[PDB]
């Protein structure tokens, strides 16, 4: 599936099976734009988290209960949700995916 294939491709499951990962089907320019949108608190108290005004197409890849390295396995869940990201630096850009509301 797409998630086994994408996780492979991006070096996310070559030396370890990453439990969860979300891929955003939007232009980089448009996800970077989220850092200047709705400011919200992060799960850890900090407030350098922002929520997109709109929903974006995303694919969540959850590892199964059975999957073990080196044979990783992912459940593919496609959706459209408001992404929540944390931003840092200049230019202020996303560095961490905080969630999908």
């Amino acid at each position: 599936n797409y998630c086994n294939q994408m996780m492979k491709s991006r070096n996310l499951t070559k030396d370890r099976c990453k439990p969860v990962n979300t891929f955003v089907h939007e232009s980089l320019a448009d996800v970077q734009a989220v850092c200047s949108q709705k400011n919200v608190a992060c799960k850890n108290g900090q407030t350098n988290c922002y929520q997109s005004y709109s929903t974006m197409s995303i694919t969540d890849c959850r590892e199964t209960g059975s999957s073990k390295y080196p044979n990783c396995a992912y459940k593919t869940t496609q959706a459209n949700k408001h992404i929540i990201v944390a931003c840092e630096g200049n230019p202020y850009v996303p560095v961490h995916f905080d969630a999908s509301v």
Binding site: R10, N21, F23, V24, H25, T59, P94
Partner: peptide
């Protein structure tokens, strides 16, 4: 290695 903004893009972007 790579910066945090680069890793984010490699891990989460799929335009």
């Amino acid at each position: 290695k790579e910066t945090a903004a680069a890793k984010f893009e490699r891990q989460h972007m799929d335009s």
